[PDB]
Amino acid sequence: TVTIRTRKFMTNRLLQRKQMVIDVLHPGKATVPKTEIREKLAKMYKTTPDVIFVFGFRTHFGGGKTTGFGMIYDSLDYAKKNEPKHRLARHGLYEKKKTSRKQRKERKNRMKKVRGTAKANVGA
Amino acid sequence: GSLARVGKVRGQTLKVAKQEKKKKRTGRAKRRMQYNRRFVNVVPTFGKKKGPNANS
Amino acid sequence: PVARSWVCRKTYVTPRRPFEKSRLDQELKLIGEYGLRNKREVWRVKFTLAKIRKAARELLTLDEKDPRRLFEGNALLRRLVRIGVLDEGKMKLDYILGLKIEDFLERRLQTQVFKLGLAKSIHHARVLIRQRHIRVRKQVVNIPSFIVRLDSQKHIDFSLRSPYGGGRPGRVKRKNAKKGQGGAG
Amino acid sequence: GKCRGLRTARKLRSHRRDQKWHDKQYKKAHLGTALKANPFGGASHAKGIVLEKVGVEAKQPNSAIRKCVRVQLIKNGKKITAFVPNDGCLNFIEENDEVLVAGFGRKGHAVGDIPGVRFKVVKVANVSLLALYKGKKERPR
Amino acid sequence: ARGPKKHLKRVAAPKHWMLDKLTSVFAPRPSTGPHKLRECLPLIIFLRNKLKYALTGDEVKKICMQRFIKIDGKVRADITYPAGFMDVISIDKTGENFRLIYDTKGRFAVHRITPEEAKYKLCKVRKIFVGTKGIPHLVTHDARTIRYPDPLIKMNDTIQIDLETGKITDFIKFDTGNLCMVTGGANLGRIGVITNRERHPGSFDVVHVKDANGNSFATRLSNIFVIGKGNKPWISLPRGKGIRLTIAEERDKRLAAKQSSG
RNA sequence: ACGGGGAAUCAGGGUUCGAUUCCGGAGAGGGAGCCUGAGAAACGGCUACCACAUCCAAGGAAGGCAGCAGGCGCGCAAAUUACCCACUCCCGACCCGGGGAGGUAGUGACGAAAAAUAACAAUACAGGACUCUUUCGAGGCCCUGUAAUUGGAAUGAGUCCACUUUAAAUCCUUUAACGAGGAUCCAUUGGAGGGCAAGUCUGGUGCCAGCAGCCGCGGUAAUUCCAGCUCCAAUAGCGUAUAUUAAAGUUGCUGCAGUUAAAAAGCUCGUAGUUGGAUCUUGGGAGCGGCCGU
């Protein structure tokens, strides 16, 4: 008994997307997961679920309505070229580096001690 | 000076154990009963008004 | 530097005399009448009026047909007429002064639950709001100080996730179903 | 005022400024002789080391021993009589203790019976003298 | 500071950008360019705050670096380029052209124009220079240096440049009765005929401009931009036609757009 | 004493504060001198001297947290050696890199907003409208109050699958399933002579101990102590110390006083200062809504 009503629609022909504000009606149940959202957009605006990035929801007080933002892309190549690497990383198609900035900062300053090619022969 | 009998009376006053008390209503409920005690209960009594802690 | 506001104000002013016998008299009656919780609940309405009222005092002392006085005049009236306090035909900025604290507490949603008959007492009406049983235009209002508007007055009814409206029973009755058939077989 | 003339701002202002010094609450605040003499140095509270326990005689109408403490401050090395409040609180105060000392109420004037005792003891060894009285804490020894 | 300023604080940022309070400490400091720090509008603000083609700061970068945005006919990849008054922003891929004219309030009117109108623009001349071989020069409000001008062009006039060549076609000479966009002060975005040029030696000349409704005001000579001969403009005006209805009048026409609309 | 935008109190005036996130200035332990550069008298640049302190194989070398964390000291007085460039933006040769700038969590009763701690029945029973009855009493259409009398409705605090959140989370929101009768899942803090809302209550103490801002209380009936009970006030807060504002028309411009309460120089002259007599354009015209206003 979930119903998605998209709203405040817009077309970026300069980012290759159809961007709108998704207004979801899910009365008497939990905040609907992003997976259930995209698959309803998929057979509403006639696209593969591959190219739909739904994010940043805000559940209304009372508990039968969420209004978040969604963007639907032309291609998967365009989906990756012009997108934050965290929203890509939710679908597993961007795998960020694992070591923290505190590791890199000491490694930057330890390299800065040595003059020449033999910088890399000190740390790790 | 005579610092010998310092804390004399608090030391020697015969201690009465504090009585078991049914827990008071707090917030609006304390304030609700306080409205009922002053403006709906008592009849306009003959003489001068007796205080909340009127004992004689 | 931080991307923050810091902008805040006090909404109540404490009385100059802490133990006026005749002030305690009135303010404790206004609690029992409209089912408030403390004197702070009273004092902030006394302050919202004394704000509204102070604006009206300033406009009355301006020149007649001053563009500020005419524009700011109609807004202060519309602000009061919408919330359903001052009359729609007596919307004149002199009648703003001839106006009192009970005219606002009548428009408090705690009272408007009780004065619509879907509560039994005003102290019960606060329970029905604080335990999210009601709504205003399919929006669950948890807070009894929801100052109701005129067009938004006739849309106050029960919630749909509550037994008092058209919804599921709570916890106490749902532990009786565990014991009702639990003891039978 | 007296001189009312439209071009008399410098006399009315300079008169008001000159005659403001004849106020007690002004000249006390705006000459730093009060602040130089104030043992707290403008501070609300101050910590200090208990070095003896004085039994101060009250004023003539009320005859009783007010059990005070001679305190020496950490910041000044200035010596102070501080009134230990309550019935038996002095018992919780021993020689060489970092007691927190506040004023008594009258902003540096001696209060009631106690002659020339302007200060009181608030805490004893970072433990409140109210908590020791109520029995909600004990003196760490 | 002991050198030039490179940061702009969101609070010290000018009001007519209408950047909010709570999103970040900093505002986009305009790169130097043809327009003044205050009197401009950065590309970043036009591309996500006004038009909302972008959402975040990287999104503004990942639009302009494909060279889709084309400020007055010559492409800028600079997100903090000062796109100021009369500048003809051309988004060619979406096929939308924008002249940056002021609204009758502070902000720049997001005004859509015909692609024929996106070929020329209007420039107020700032001074006449005489070059190094008796070559006369103009300087414009948008830093455009044109040489061999028409000798009848003076230095409070406006000229009609072409984006393709960078040369004058026609001009509006500063006379009385000619239109006037007020491009500064309390009257930012008013349109109306010039009725009195009042001369002050040493100090600044005030000029009295009458609106279409006879809503007469005055502005200093610095803040005048003549946009037509008589009551006829050379450009496309924003909706409302820079007439400036008052707050009494703005309320009646706001509520009738809710009353009769429902 | 960094200045200003401002802040607190505020009838009308004012009075006080402004180290503090925005603007401008200044300085990087104290001074001073310079190099490079468009821009520095730069200090996460240099060179000196002074103070301070570091490693040393004793020859020398190295330093600058009024950056973010943290430590020590000083004190009445103030937070994590956390996460992150995703946001805001800035810098670079740059769509790609970097940023303790900034953002996000932690600590946080500095403070500000919202707002639980029950609700409604039943019966005992005690009132008041009311037919009645002199009263006593009953009816009860209207309900009115409160009990370790009972009753079934509630929703939250919390434990907490999962989503949402977000750079990743947390929290909020959303939602399952649980989760309240001495609903022990128990609200404090100050008070109760007067000022000032609230006990001529009991028990102890006997000018003692203590209270008490002030006036006062305590001398054996204590409305003031020490306790018990009851009660009052504000309430998730409330007391205390101190700075400050109103109160203070007790600084008086608004607006005070000066015979006797504090106060008019012993007297006159006198320059700045302040303050200064009356007097110079009015009379008509000419149209306007009902002698009249324009």
CATH code for position E224: 2.30.30.30
Contact D83, D97 (CB under 8 A): no
C61 part of contact set with chain E, CB < 8 Å: no
Residues of chain B found within 8 Å of residue D87, distances taken between Cβ atoms? 7-10
Q: Has residue E61 been placed in a domain?
A: yes
Task: Please choose, from the candidates E2, E7, E5, the residue with its C-alpha nearest in 3D space to the C-alpha of residue E24.
Answer: E7
Nucleotide nearest to D111 (CA to C1'): F213
Residues from C contacting A (CB-CB < 8 Å) are: 132, 135, 138-140, 142, 160-161
Name the domain count of chain A.
Answer: 1
* Interface touch E52/A10, C-beta < 8 Å: yes
Alpha-carbon gap, residue C93 to D96, rounded angstroms: 70
List phi, psi (to 5°) of C51. -70, -65
C1' (F22) to CA (E24) span, angstroms: 14
C1' (F134) to CA (C172) span, angstroms: 55
- Where is E88: in which H helix or E strand? strand E88-91
Residues E126 and E229 reside in one and the same domain: no
Nucleotide nearest to C174 (CA to C1'): F153
Alpha-carbon gap, residue D54 to D62, rounded angstroms: 18
Alpha-carbon gap, residue E213 to B52, rounded angstroms: 74
Nucleotide nearest to D86 (CA to C1'): F210
Residue E260, CB-side half-sphere exposure with 13 Å CA sphere: 6
Task: Please choose, from the candidates E219, E216, E218, E225, the residue with its C-alpha nearest in 3D space to the C-alpha of residue E160.
Answer: E225
For this entry, resolution in Å reads 3.1
A15 part of contact set with chain E, CB < 8 Å: yes
List phi, psi (to 5°) of C35. 65, 45
* Interface touch C67/E247, C-beta < 8 Å: yes
Contact E227, E213 (CB under 8 A): no
Q: Which chain C residue has its CA at the smallest distance from B36's CA?
A: C32
Nucleotide nearest to C180 (CA to C1'): F152
Contact E44, E57 (CB under 8 A): yes
Alpha-carbon gap, residue D80 to B51, rounded angstroms: 46
Which residues are paired to D52 by β-bridges? D70
Cα–Cα distances in angstroms (integers) from residue A53 to residues A20, A42, C72, in the given order: 11, 11, 47
Contact D86, D80 (CB under 8 A): no
Helices first, then strands: H and E counts in chain A: 4, 4
Alpha-carbon gap, residue E154 to E224, rounded angstroms: 14
Contact C46, B53 (CB under 8 A): no
A25 part of contact set with chain C, CB < 8 Å: no
Alpha-carbon gap, residue D101 to E18, rounded angstroms: 54
Domain coverage including residue E163: 121-171
Burial A89-119 (b: 16+ CB within 10 A, else e): eeeeeeeeeeeeeeeeeebeeeeeeeeeeee
- Where is A36: in which H helix or E strand? helix A34-42
**For chain B, what percentages of helix, strand and coil (3-state, to nearest 5) are there?**
30, 0, 70
C1' (F215) to CA (D84) span, angstroms: 24
Q: Please tell me which of the candidates E56, E58, E63 has its beta carbon nearest to residue A14.
A: E63
What CATH number is attached to the domain comprising A71?
3.30.70.3370
Tokens 């623009």, residue located: E121
Which pair of structure tokens corresponds to residue C70? Answer: 């005419």
Indicate the burial class of E24 (C-beta count within 10 angstroms; 0-12, 13-18, 19 or more).
middle
Q: Please tell me which of the candidates C3, C67, C74 has its beta carbon nearest to residue E23.
A: C3
* Interface touch A62/C160, C-beta < 8 Å: no
Chains C and E touch (3+ CB pairs under 8 A): yes
DSSP letter, residue B24: P
Cα–Cα distances in angstroms (integers) from residue D110 to residues D81, D104, D106, E156, in the given order: 11, 8, 7, 79
Cα–Cα distances in angstroms (integers) from residue E212 to residues D113, E101, E184, E240, E244, in the given order: 85, 18, 20, 11, 10
Tell me the three state secondary structure of residue E64. helix
Give me the DSSP letters along A41-67: HHTTTT--GGGEEEE---BPTTSSEEE
Chains D and A touch (3+ CB pairs under 8 A): no
Residues from B contacting C (CB-CB < 8 Å) are: 27-29, 31-32, 34-36, 38-39
C1' (F273) to CA (D10) span, angstroms: 10
Which pair of structure tokens corresponds to residue A50? Answer: 């591959």
List phi, psi (to 5°) of B37. -70, -25
Tell me the three state secondary structure of residue A22. strand
What number of residues does chain A have?
Answer: 124
What's the order of all strands across the beta sheet hosting A65-73? A3-12, A17-25, A65-73, A52-55
Angle between helical axes of C21-34 and C39-60 (0-180°, round to 10): 100
Domain coverage including residue A73: 1-124
C1' (F216) to CA (D112) span, angstroms: 10
* Interface touch E94/A10, C-beta < 8 Å: no
Alpha-carbon gap, residue C99 to C44, rounded angstroms: 16
Alpha-carbon gap, residue B39 to C32, rounded angstroms: 9
What number of residues does chain B have?
Answer: 56
Contact A79, A51 (CB under 8 A): yes
Query: What separation, in Å, do the N-terminal and C-terminal C-alpha atoms of chain B show?
Result: 44
Residues of chain C found within 8 Å of residue B34, distances taken between Cβ atoms? 28
Q: Please tell me which of the candidates D55, D57, D88 has its beta carbon nearest to residue B7.
A: D88
Alpha-carbon gap, residue D68 to D83, rounded angstroms: 4
Alpha-carbon gap, residue E71 to E53, rounded angstroms: 16
Can you give the C-alpha Rg of chain D in angstroms?
A: 21
Alpha-carbon gap, residue A62 to A70, rounded angstroms: 23
D53 part of contact set with chain B, CB < 8 Å: yes
How many CB atoms are closer than 10 A to CB D110? Answer: 15
Residue C103 distance to chain B (closest CA, Å): 20
Name residues whose C-beta falls within 8 Å of residue C12's C-beta, 6 or more positions apart in sequence.
Answer: C40, C43, C44, C46, C47
Name the domain count of chain E.
Answer: 3
Tell me the three state secondary structure of residue C129. helix
Chain B interface disruption, residue of D63, D65, D95, D132, most B CBs within 10 A: D65
Tokens 């009585």, residue located: B19
Task: Please choose, from the candidates E35, E38, E112, E123, the residue with its C-alpha nearest in 3D space to the C-alpha of residue E86.
Answer: E123
Subunits next to B (3 or more Cβ pairs <8 Å) are C, D
Alpha-carbon gap, residue D82 to E12, rounded angstroms: 53
Query: What separation, in Å, do the N-terminal and C-terminal C-alpha atoms of chain D show?
Result: 65
Residues E14 and E79 reside in one and the same domain: yes
D87 part of contact set with chain B, CB < 8 Å: yes
Cα–Cα distances in angstroms (integers) from residue E33 to residues A8, B2, E76, E81, E119, in the given order: 35, 88, 11, 7, 21
Residues of chain D found within 8 Å of residue B13, distances taken between Cβ atoms? none
Tokens 């009312």, residue located: D4
Strands D119-124 and D79-83: parallel
Chains C and B touch (3+ CB pairs under 8 A): yes
Alpha-carbon gap, residue E171 to D12, rounded angstroms: 64
Name residues whose C-beta falls within 8 Å of residue B29's C-beta, 6 or more positions apart in sequence.
Answer: C123
Residues E178 and E156 reside in one and the same domain: no
Residue type, E212: A
Chain E interface disruption, residue of C5, C71, C151, most E CBs within 10 A: C71
Q: Has residue E29 been placed in a domain?
A: yes
Residues E102 and E64 reside in one and the same domain: yes
What's the order of all strands across the beta sheet hosting E206-210? E193-198, E206-210, E217-220
Tokens 């002095």, residue located: D90
**How many interface pairs between B and C have CB atoms less than 8 angstroms apart?**
30
Q: Which chain A residue has its CA at the smallest distance from C132's CA?
A: A62
Which pair of structure tokens corresponds to residue E218? Answer: 């005055």
